Design a protein around this motif. Structure first.
Motif, short mmCIF file in Angstrom:
data_model
loop_
_atom_site.label_atom_id
_atom_site.label_comp_id
_atom_site.label_asym_id
_atom_site.label_seq_id
_atom_site.Cartn_x
_atom_site.Cartn_y
_atom_site.Cartn_z
N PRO A 1 0.82 -1.21 0.00
CA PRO A 1 0.00 0.00 0.00
C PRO A 1 0.85 1.26 0.00
CG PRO A 1 0.13 -0.84 2.22
CD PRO A 1 0.95 -1.79 1.35
N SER A 2 0.22 2.35 -0.41
CA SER A 2 0.88 3.65 -0.41
C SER A 2 1.19 4.07 1.02
CB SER A 2 -0.01 4.67 -1.11
OG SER A 2 0.03 5.92 -0.45
N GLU B 1 11.32 1.65 3.98
CA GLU B 1 9.96 1.51 4.45
C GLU B 1 9.37 0.20 3.93
OE1 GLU B 1 8.24 5.01 2.72
OE2 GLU B 1 7.40 3.92 0.99
N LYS B 2 8.37 -0.30 4.67
CA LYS B 2 7.64 -1.52 4.32
C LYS B 2 8.55 -2.75 4.24
CE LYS B 2 5.47 0.86 0.93
NZ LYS B 2 4.54 1.02 -0.23
N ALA B 3 9.62 -2.78 5.04
CA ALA B 3 10.49 -3.95 5.09
C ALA B 3 9.79 -5.16 5.70
CB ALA B 3 11.77 -3.64 5.87
N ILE B 4 8.69 -4.95 6.42
CA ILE B 4 7.87 -6.03 6.96
C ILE B 4 6.47 -5.87 6.39
CG2 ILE B 4 6.97 -7.14 9.02
CD1 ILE B 4 9.26 -6.44 10.57
N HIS B 5 6.02 -6.85 5.63
CA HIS B 5 4.74 -6.78 4.94
C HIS B 5 3.97 -8.08 5.16
CE1 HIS B 5 7.20 -8.76 1.78
NE2 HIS B 5 8.08 -7.84 2.14
N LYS B 6 2.93 -8.28 4.34
CA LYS B 6 2.03 -9.42 4.52
C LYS B 6 2.73 -10.75 4.23
CE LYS B 6 -2.74 -10.26 3.18
NZ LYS B 6 -3.71 -10.07 2.07
N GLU B 7 3.60 -10.79 3.22
CA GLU B 7 4.20 -12.03 2.73
C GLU B 7 5.39 -12.51 3.56
OE1 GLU B 7 1.48 -10.49 0.45
OE2 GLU B 7 3.37 -9.37 0.32
N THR C 1 6.67 -1.20 8.91
CA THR C 1 5.68 -2.26 9.08
C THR C 1 4.36 -1.83 8.48
OG1 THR C 1 6.75 -2.85 11.17
CG2 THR C 1 4.60 -3.83 10.71
N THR C 2 3.89 -2.56 7.47
CA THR C 2 2.61 -2.25 6.86
C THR C 2 1.46 -2.66 7.78
OG1 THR C 2 2.29 -4.34 5.67
CG2 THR C 2 3.69 -2.67 4.61
#
Lengths: 504, 504, 504
Positions: free
Chosen positions: C9-10, C333-339, C357-358
């Motif tokens: 996500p943005s 940023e977003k180094a930790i996401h859903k996958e 973290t998203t």
């Protein structure tokens, strides 16, 4: 004739010769401090030499003429001058003379010296100097007031008076009441919307925003400068002296503000002031002279001559050649030159006046190997430090200690009461824990001047130590003047280095 | 009829009669303080009398009218006034009333009183006062807001609102939310380039730059003013009392902000508050009334009447004539006049209101020889001190203690740990050195209000002592009002003396 | 797809989703804080929802284009952007990036985050962010300087640079020397009459008004944020850990300024840093890595690869999934996401980077029940606190401690001497009372950075405790992010509440 062999050189030439000695020492260090992956070492040395070329000359001089109405109704034209030597930090800072000796060359040379003295005591102002060409004794109080208000307006219209641009101070022929008049004129006219108008000038009366502790500040700084150097055995032994100020004999050339307050502090420190030499008479006493009695006598009779607590002295102009541990030049410039340097027997010279030692004399005495000169741009800069505190006070709009004296006193009493409770629990008897005699006296007389005194003492010790460290790092021996210019040049240069000198 | 025999004199006439008593005492001192070798003693006395002639009248009054739109759609015209009594220091300072009793004469008289109260607590502001002629209860919150924003704009366009020119405050009919609105209107319009916009007014909500400790400050200053005088045996014996506040009985006329907070501090100090007299009812209890219960009861029922912890009192308007050690007038002006002064039995009167004692009554009670009046322009000036701290805070752009609470706490713990280490080395056993119960509580609740409290307590003690010293130096007896005006006049005069009054 | 299930996500959408969670929790409290007898509860809820609707979007964005002359003589057009998210307090605050990734959407999203981080550490600035769209490595120092001076002028002409309106800072691709250039350009042009010009920007070199302690400040704040949470047994037990930082194992993603200084503080605190993962290689050592040796090696070879004091690690991008007590995301940023959220084994995540973290990952890890995330807008805000102190310093025109180090040192020595005198009187022998080894070291190295360090530590503890109290009051469990947004929203809302939102 080279400067180290001239007899009566211009004051501006002395400042620039001393500047060159310092610049030569510190130049390699300045090159190393220029961080740039784009410039070669050759490029850096060319830019450093450009920066030093811009520092030495005075940036700006304003000259004015204006009429005044004498009290009887005729009119006269008056000349005045204001020099701003360096604008690398603003506002610039420096005093205003009323004297028949003011001229463009004199306000130029002393404005240069003032840039280096501000840097020496870590005070963030470029150097300025000003003057009005009059004999203030020939004028009434009403005429002095009209002259004073007019220089305020004309200087302030062109950016030579104001809290952010240029902040003056008293000097020969002016005092605190002229400073109050300038501050009032600025606040009602050019500065009428300025929230910090009372910060346009320092040396003001207390009621108008002046600061406690200003009167004695230059003398207190001469004492603290000697104390920094008297505690060093390496130097005291090279000149044939033992550490410390108690016991040392002192001869003082001049009994103005600076000479008298220096005498008070050196006497209180345990030194013996054996000689006072004035412009028309001298006195001496190998047991010491008591400051309060001497000042009282001159106050009543009009002179230090025939002081009951001492004897008058043979050709009064030769007292400064007598043996002593410390000589304090506190009068006119170039009092020590080529033709009389050898006749000087003091082991320490503390320059409580602007440039009292010419470069020829400074060199004759450095070669003799037994004489330590503490440089004027450091040791008579105590008043410059406290004028920075007065400017701060007017910007803060509150006196120092107003919101902390009672808060800190009550914390200290709760601290001592906590110690008393723990002590009594531990030894199992009653055991008062109170401030001792010295601490109770400080607590009871706590006031703004104590903060000012501590601020000044802090600055003089730090700057005095930095001069010593620089003199040891470059093997300068007893040449503390060259070390002091090198520290001063280094600070100004770093402003130019980070501000950016690439344009031109 | 002379002022000392009138029955209902104008408030401005009372202030000027008291001004004259003080001026007469201090005039020789003012002459001696004028240092000038150009003026004779006769000249100095003529200039001093000119300066005092300029101090008494109000310098400036601004009057305005403006329309507002009622909520239903019709329009009304509103009047307002702002007086600046003295500009010898700027900004001027004083509150704003919303009340049907505001008029030119009232904002004039209280602005004069305010100049003298600022001088009394060493606060560097001339006096100002303002008012809007409305009954605030007849208007909705939306209408109050429109009126408040409009007076901000119109006052600020003409130099009657701004951090460097004039700084208002709450008063009867206004509070902190109106102050937030004025500060916001100024910052978005006339003051849109002003870096210090939030300093244009004091009494603001905390979130908008208000200061902790403001609400209770006027009461805390009444308590500290009594404590300065209760520790003096010379005066307590002349009036038939023993030193100190514990045990003394207190009757308070008024249960507003000032009366209620004064009751809290005097109760905590060990005094017995035996009587509260309001506008429609009175209560009493010779054992004392508990502040928290009384405030709770009025909060729930709507009045102090039928308080379970006391009895209601016979013709409620006569409680202030009953015997007590301390009477605190905290209501309307001229509550003590010629026709009822003799009926007063209190030994100390602490004027927690503006001019509650007329000159006739003040004289009847000075002649009776047994009654010590602590003057309003000193003892109800605690809130003026803290409003100076709020202005300072907005100029500093940081709250007090933000950069020192942890630094000083850690130094104090290292100090106590150093003492513990040295104690254990000396007595050869374990021996904890910790903050005691009182010190640990202060350390744990350290906050801006503690700095504010200490600042206020410092100022009231210093100013209270200066009143006493002046009263003893001029043999004024128990006439502390005259001594207080003389100290206040002396400060204002010295501004004019150094600013320069030669022009005219 | 809902935000809690999206994959990439943005950034602006993440900030607003987290904003909504906090707003939902704190909304009833905001309604209760609106004191108004004119509004019903329904009216208050409608105005509160209007205020929150205005807070979320960015208020202002300025976009500029301008030519520059390359060194060889051709010309290029450069784009730049400056966003001001909230003006509820002025000036706004935030850094400037030189990077090919700058765009309108990115300066918008990070300016929003910056408003909430300022509120989190009680710093009175709205949020701003800026950027210049260039690859700074492709330009010479002369070209960088021309670009930097031009953005200063153009931003300052429109109110996007100045001490009272908008105060920038360094970021990726800029540093302290660009900051010195901006400050010098502003002072000589648009800001030539501004008394506080050097306060237009922070991150400056020391000589130009920068502050000691800035370089390590963001790392020192990550350490202090972990320490606030490691002392809490309720939370440490829920995640299977024992109190305190000594002994805990730490893996750090990134070896820039933030990662390296965090490693230094965590090592000094007794933690074991077992793994460093970079963009192209990773290293590890289960016994710990020594910070000074690792930094030295990379300094000489150019990389952390083949560090003698550790081994290189298998597919370097997977080090962050290994077991540890603490993981410190300090990179992108977003180094930790859903996958990849499930693959994370750390018990504590300390977000030393903007939004690592998203919302999908944050939810997967909250459901697993065993992982405590310390939110970025709190824990990597240490540098924001110290930039507020640098602005203060330039407004004070003096360095912290200049007028207090010697005064306070001398009071402390008189205190210890008073204790020594009372102890010796009580036990009847000689008993030295001196500063212990730790206290003598602090006294001797006392400097501005110690005041800065204590200021920062004070703020992080206070704000960390307020997050915990809010999380316990609303039963949020280990969801500290939602508690942090709720505290931040509440502060911004109260500005709007008292400023007045009635207009529209």
């Amino acid at each position: 004739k080279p400067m180290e062999e001239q007899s009566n050189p211009s004051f501006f030439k002395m400042v620039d010769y001393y500047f060159d000695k310092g610049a030569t020492v510190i130049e390699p260090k300045l090159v190393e401090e220029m961080k740039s992956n784009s410039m070669s070492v050759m490029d850096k040395k060319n830019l450093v030499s450009g920066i030093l070329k811009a520092i030495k000359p005075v940036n700006k001089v304003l000259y004015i003429t204006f009429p005044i109405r004498r009290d009887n109704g005729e009119f006269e034209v008056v000349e005045a001058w204001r020099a701003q030597h360096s604008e690398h930090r603003t506002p610039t800072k420096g005093g205003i003379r009323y004297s028949l000796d003011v001229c463009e060359d004199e306000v130029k040379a002393l404005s240069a010296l003032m840039t280096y003295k501000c840097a020496a005591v870590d005070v963030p102002f470029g150097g300025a100097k000003g003057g009005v060409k009059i004999d203030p004794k020939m004028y009434t109080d009403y005429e002095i007031e009209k002259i004073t208000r007019r220089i305020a307006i004309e200087f302030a219209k062109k950016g030579f008076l104001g809290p952010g641009v240029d902040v003056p101070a008293p000097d020969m022929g002016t005092g605190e009441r002229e400073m109050g008049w300038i501050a009032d004129t600025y606040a009602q006219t050019i500065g009428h919307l300025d929230r910090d108008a009372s910060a346009c000038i320092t040396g003001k009366p207390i009621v108008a925003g002046g600061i406690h502790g200003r009167v004695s500040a230059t003398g207190r700084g001469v004492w603290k400068g000697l104390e920094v150097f008297a505690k060093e055995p390496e130097y005291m032994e090279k000149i044939g002296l033992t550490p410390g100020l108690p016991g040392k004999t002192v001869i003082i050339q001049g009994f103005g503000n600076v000479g008298l307050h220096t005498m008070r502090y050196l006497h209180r420190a345990g030194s013996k002031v054996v000689g006072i030499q004035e412009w028309d008479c001298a006195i001496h006493n190998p047991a010491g002279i008591h400051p309060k009695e001497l000042e009282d006598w001159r106050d009543q009779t009009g002179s230090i001559k025939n002081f009951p607590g001492a004897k008058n002295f043979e050709p009064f102009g030769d007292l400064i050649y007598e043996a002593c541990d410390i000589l304090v030049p506190a009068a006119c410039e170039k009092a020590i030159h080529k033709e009389n340097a050898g006749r000087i027997q003091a082991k320490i010279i503390a320059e409580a006046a602007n440039g009292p030692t010419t470069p020829a004399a400074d060199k004759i005495l450095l070669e003799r190997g037994n004489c330590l000169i503490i440089p004027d741009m450091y040791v008579n800069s105590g008043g410059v430090t406290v004028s920075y505190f007065e400017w701060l006070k007017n910007l803060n709009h509150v006196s120092y200690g107003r919101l902390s004296f009672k808060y800190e006193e009550d914390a200290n009493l709760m601290l001592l009461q906590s110690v008393q409770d723990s002590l009594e629990k531990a030894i199992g008897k009653e055991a008062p824990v109170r401030p001792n005699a010295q601490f109770a006296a400080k607590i009871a007389g706590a006031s703004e001047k104590d903060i000012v005194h501590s601020g000044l003492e802090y600055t003089m010790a730090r700057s005095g130590e930095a001069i010593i460290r620089t003199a040891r790092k470059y093997n300068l021996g007893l040449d503390m003047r060259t070390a002091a210019y090198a520290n001063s040049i280094e600070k100004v240069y770093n402003t130019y280095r980070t501000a950016g000198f690439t344009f031109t």
